[PDB]
């Protein structure tokens, strides 16, 4: 197109196109800011899901053994002048080991040794009786 | 998935971030543009965004990285909702229409230099239904162009 | 509204922390009991539970209330899938592996931040082989077992 009329149409179309491009430049930039804004919130939410699951795991693994131990001693417990004094002597010994765990963090193995001691002495007191 | 046309609309948007034309950006330009469009990212949030895509650890990133940075597993209604928030960055006062004053507000924050007559050139070109404003349908049509 | 077998296991746990036996514990202990029972609220969720059961500022929680909470939390719970998916977000390359250091940075700087020492404890478990690289799919199955 070399005509002076065609060329004026051209300048109109090109001027329109440019305007439609200034729009898309700022609109798509607007959409970028939005998308970025959401990436930050997407990444935070996923971070928090890792964080909470870790807080939980860190906590459970410290205390579950101590609950389990507690239960073990607590079950044992559930299971006239001479016999009673020898057995009440065990309940009190149990409630003591049960208060020990409820009052001081201790390893499953430590709990286990104490528990084993309670079982042996207790089997001998329920075998005689 | 992005079509080449969309990447190209995006490449243009990138130029508002990468003002100096070297083809790369830092959290500095990330935060500047974002803040000028209403957002309030913290430095920590910006630094993290970068880390995900800053392969060579330069602290600097480029256009393909900039695009991956904007990606994430989205929901069903999420694309449409983002277009709506993009609208509401212009329609700041939430009446459902972009007016000239509102267009200029954004153009000024982004630092575009233009005369009041050009801004009206812009409203006029997008204003299909001819009411002196820009509704959501028309803004979308323009974005799509 | 909870299995006799369930309510029983909770009391088993609730009673480790209630030394005196008044069926009461401290508000700070709430999180420790929920977590031992395998629940995983966020710090904000905890603070909400406390702000609605501690109007009188006494800082006590009794078994009844603790059950009420253990029933709300149980109705809105993240599957192992979801938590793995959350980890995946921080896997630049999709390997199924993230570097210890990458994990430490995200988590001591975003979200509800962890202490360095808490993270130290996780790395000790999550990167057993000391190559400074965690397979999160395995670490998550473990945590949630
Ligand atoms: Ca640059
Ligand atoms: Ca880079
Ligand atoms: Ca408006
Ligand atoms: Ca209009
Ligand atoms: Mg008490
Ligand atoms: Mg109370
Ligand atoms: Mg990786
Ligand atoms: Mg490892």
UniProtKB/Swiss-Prot annotation, chain A:
Compartment(s): Golgi apparatus, trans-Golgi network membrane; Golgi apparatus; Nucleus; Cytoplasm, Perinuclear region
**Region (Required for binding calmodulin) spans which residues?**
12-40
- Using the UniProt annotation, give all residue ranges assigned to the region (Three-helix bundle): 65-129
PTM summary from the entry reads: Phosphorylation in the motor domain, induced by EGF, results in translocation of MYO6 from the cell surface to membrane ruffles and affects F-actin dynamics. Phosphorylated in vitro by p21-activated kinase (PAK).
Q: Where is the IQ domain?
A: 43-72
Family of this protein: Belongs to the TRAFAC class myosin-kinesin ATPase superfamily. Myosin family.
- Assembly information from the UniProt record: Homodimer; dimerization seems to implicate the unfolding of the three-helix bundle region creating an additional calmodulin binding site, and cargo binding. Component of the DISP/DOCK7-induced septin displacement complex, at least composed of DOCK7, LRCH3 and MYO6. Able to function as a monomer under specific conditions in vitro. Forms a complex with CFTR and DAB2 in the apical membrane of epithelial cells.
Q: What does this protein do?
A: Myosins are actin-based motor molecules with ATPase activity. Unconventional myosins serve in intracellular movements. Myosin 6 is a reverse-direction motor protein that moves towards the minus-end of actin filaments. Has slow rate of actin-activated ADP release due to weak ATP binding. Functions in a variety of intracellular processes such as vesicular membrane trafficking and cell migration. Required for the structural integrity of the Golgi apparatus via the p53-dependent pro-survival pathway.
Domain comment, as recorded: Divided into three regions: a N-terminal motor (head) domain, followed by a neck domain consisting of a calmodulin-binding linker domain and a single IQ motif, and a C-terminal tail region with a three-helix bundle region, a SAH domain and a unique globular domain required for interaction with other proteins such as cargo-binding.
Name under which the protein is recorded:
Unconventional myosin-VI
From which source organism is this entry? Sus scrofa (Pig)
> What gene codes for this chain?
MYO6
From Swiss-Prot, chains B, C:
- Modified positions (N6,N6,N6-trimethyllysine) in chain numbering: 92
Query: Do you know which CDD domains this protein is assigned to?
Result: EFh
User: What's one GO-annotated cellular component?
Assistant: spindle
So which domain of life are we looking at?
A: Eukaryota
Q: Which InterPro entries match?
A: CALM/Myosin/TropC-like, EF-hand-dom_pair, EF_Hand_1_Ca_BS, EF_hand_dom
Phenotype upon gene inactivation: RNAi-mediated knockdown in the perineurial glia increases ethanol sedation resistance and decreases ethanol tolerance.
User: A Pfam family in this protein?
Assistant: EF-hand_7
Task: Please state where this protein is localized.
Answer: Cytoplasm, Cell cortex
Q: Residues that bind Ca(2+) 4, according to the entry? A: 127, 129, 131, 133, 138
Which Cys pairs are S-S linked? none
**Where along the chain is Ca(2+) 1 bound?**
18, 20, 22, 24, 29
What does the PTM comment state?
A: Trimethylation of Lys-113 observed in other calmodulins is absent here, but does occur at Lys-92 specifically in the compound eye.
Select a single GO molecular function from the record's annotations and give it. myosin heavy chain binding
Record-annotated site: Not N6-methylated: 113
Q: Where is the EF-hand domain?
A: 5-40, 41-76, 78-113, 114-145
Q: Which residues bind Ca(2+) 3?
A: 91, 93, 95, 102
One Gene Ontology biological process: sensory perception of sound
Q: Which family does it belong to?
A: Belongs to the calmodulin family.
Q: What is the protein's known function?
A: Calmodulin mediates the control of a large number of enzymes, ion channels and other proteins by Ca(2+). Among the enzymes to be stimulated by the calmodulin-Ca(2+) complex are a number of protein kinases and phosphatases. In photoreceptor cells, light-induced Ca(2+) influx activates calmodulin, which in turn is likely to promote Crag activity in trafficking of newly synthesized ninaE (Rh1) from the trans-Golgi network to rhabdomere membranes. Together with Akap200, regulates PKA activity and ethanol-induced sensitivity and tolerance.
Q: What is this protein called?
A: Calmodulin
